[PDB]
């Protein structure tokens, strides 16, 4: 339910202004969850454990990725489309049992 | 108060003004009390808090 | 707290409770009707036609000056007794409240309803004055009902209008009676009647 | 006896009162247009204030499918005699100063509700 | 819901917070009240009760009938048919007439809509924005629950005329009146709407925040990196902060 | 016997209730005949309590 | 359990002529037995079956499904009969306070919470002196987990 990015180039403050600037289209169709798993510094991945997570002070969260659709557009061509899939975005605590 | 639809509880009937719908308790503490009037002396209750 | 006859008999007390008791119009009446009457002599209600045209007998005014619309008012008899008013104070009241402006016809005493009938007269030499502009010019029916809703809300017929409800009981304690010293010496506590 | 209000029959507006001196009768008249009617009765408003309520036709027939309404057997039908009926208290802010029992007959094909 | 103030000047009024189902552009309080008798003026004797409505950013009082027309109803038959179910109700008739007798200067749909964004905030200019923004109350604010999209005014009207019923019938006391401390008339907020909330507010901040990244780095006429346009802290950051 | 004295009074509550329900209780002066009823009741269990 | 879920709270407002359907989130329900012709739905065969799934599988969503246990909410309780007890229901109908039941409570000791049904014969006792108990339930001694 949430509405899809729009855009247009906006390049005003620059002499030879295109008359139709390229535009752009993001777009969120898709949600994986996986399972609370922690990155430790050297940023290797383990699952951390409800045990783990209250003697570290940790949070117990997991991450979060979307599919993201973007499109490139150009008046008078063919637009693109390009899939970014399993983008991460955050950690969403997770409720226990 | 009728907190329903003229009845303080649905295990009663409507319109029903006799002892048992209105809050009178006619059993002891001793004997032990049928759970509407339980109700009604936990709504009595409340009010000296 | 009361004195004489009023302390101790309880018609003077409730006499005294209808000078005090704020009775409007809204504790006393049954309904309200507002009809159109273009003959007075011959009008629609045939319960009326018995004692109209005793009241148009002899008239107080010219019957072709007045308006055609009347206020019809129906009133309860029990409210009435209760009250202890008679009729002649309620005409008089609208007498006084209402100037000359309206003529009052009221129904017997003895009859099975009490029905009024009040009226306006066309104040012919008071339709030619001048300055009236964006004034809301005033229709004769809608000006019948709003000074309806005025005798109806507003005016009083006895009582005190900053007085609500009246009570009327006897004590039973020695704190509200009239404690007196009789011949013998002693201490006597009379529980007269007496207002809340 | 009471009157409502009539709809005009070219734009459905209001027909008000009104007072023509030529004839001596009431016109009900439209005020956005130009359609007129006389007058059937003779009262503009009437306001009640001690007004008797005919709650008989104001309670749903339909409660007699109620099973939180008490049911009594000993009050007959007027109408049907039926032995069964359903008593209640009125709804409204003028009968509970009365303590007033109103009997609805369960029977679905005749419905009486009457009072006793 | 319907209420009674034992102060003020209304006799009654009817509340209702409609929202849209599981959506953004939060919940929306719509009032429709009834005037006090005890008002200290002539002409307002015969008026006596009169019937006003409270709209979404408006600070001013309406009546429901300028309201009425203003959907796309101009005869007042149609109004009736639409609040007035059965039309042999004498004193519900009678009831209906003094907002009625209020509203003789609007007749007309257009003339409605000025008359609404004439009182609302940030009044337009000759008329036609008035209109415009008329018609977005209309559609936006007023009860987005039963719909927003477009010809939605005929859905839109029939609740308008139950609820005004509900106002008159409850001015009666043919039904009982609403009471606050009822708990039917409650819901319970757990875990799983307040979190779809700080999603909602934390999705709104990661769209403008994406939104902003890409708009700083389209002005040059160069791309962007999708991995390097969302900041991963901005949702775990206000989670882990509210809880 | 305080069982049956809480049963007679039961039994007048029920009679008081149904003289009401006939149009037979005469309203005290001072206050309505919800009032009247409520005081009757409230005075009938208190003496019997 | 076709289309509708037992979770729908439904209304009909007889003496007002309305149906009115819920669907939504934060309403409250109480499971409770179904009670037509002054008779319950649940026999000794469910109690057979209640019996096995200590052995393998007649769970409880099992009794829902099978007609005899509906979810009934707080709006729901303005139309509905519940009862005490089956010994209400076998009453004869010369002395029968009701005769048309809707439904019946399983136990009515399951009104109270957590820390107030730690009271041994609460009905016995005083409702402040309940709360108060329920009040310094929580702050008790114990093993608080293993
Ligand atoms: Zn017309
Ligand atoms: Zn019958």
Redesign the interface.
Known sequence: DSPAIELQAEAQHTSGEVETPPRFSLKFEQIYLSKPTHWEKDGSPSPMMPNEARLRNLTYSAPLYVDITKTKNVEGLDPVETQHQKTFIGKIPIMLR | PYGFRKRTLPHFIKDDYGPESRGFVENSYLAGLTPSEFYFHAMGGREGL | FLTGGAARDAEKAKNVLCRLEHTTLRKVTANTAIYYDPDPQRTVISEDQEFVNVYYEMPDFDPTRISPWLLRIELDRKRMTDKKLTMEQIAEKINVGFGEDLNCIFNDDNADKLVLRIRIMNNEENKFQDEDEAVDKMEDDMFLRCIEANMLSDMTLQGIEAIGKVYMHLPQTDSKKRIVITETGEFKAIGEWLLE | G?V??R?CQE????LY?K?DKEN???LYAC??CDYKQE?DS??????????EIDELT???P??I???????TEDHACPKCSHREAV???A????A??????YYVCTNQNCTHRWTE | YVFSMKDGKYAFKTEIRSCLEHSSRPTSTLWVNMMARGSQNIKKSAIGQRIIAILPYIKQEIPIMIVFRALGFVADRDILEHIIYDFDDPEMMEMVKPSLDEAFVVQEQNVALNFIGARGARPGVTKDKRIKYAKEILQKEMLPHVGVSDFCETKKAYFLGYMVHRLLLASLGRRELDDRDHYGNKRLDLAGPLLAFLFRGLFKNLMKEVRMYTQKFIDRGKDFNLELAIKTNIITDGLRYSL | EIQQAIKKAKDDVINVIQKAHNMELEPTPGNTLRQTFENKVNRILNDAR | MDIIVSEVSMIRDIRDREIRIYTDAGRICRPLLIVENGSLLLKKTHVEMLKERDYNNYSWQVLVASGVVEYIDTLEEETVMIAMSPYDLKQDKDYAYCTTYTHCEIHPAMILGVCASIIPFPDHNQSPRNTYQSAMGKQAMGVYIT
């Open positions: 009471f409502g209000i709809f734009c459905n507006n209001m009162p007072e001596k009768i009431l005020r956005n007058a003779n009262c503009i408003y009437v306001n009640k204030i001690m007004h104001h309670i749903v339909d409660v499918s109620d099973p939180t309404l008490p049911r008593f209640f208290q709804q409204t802010r003028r509970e100063e009365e303590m007033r029992l």
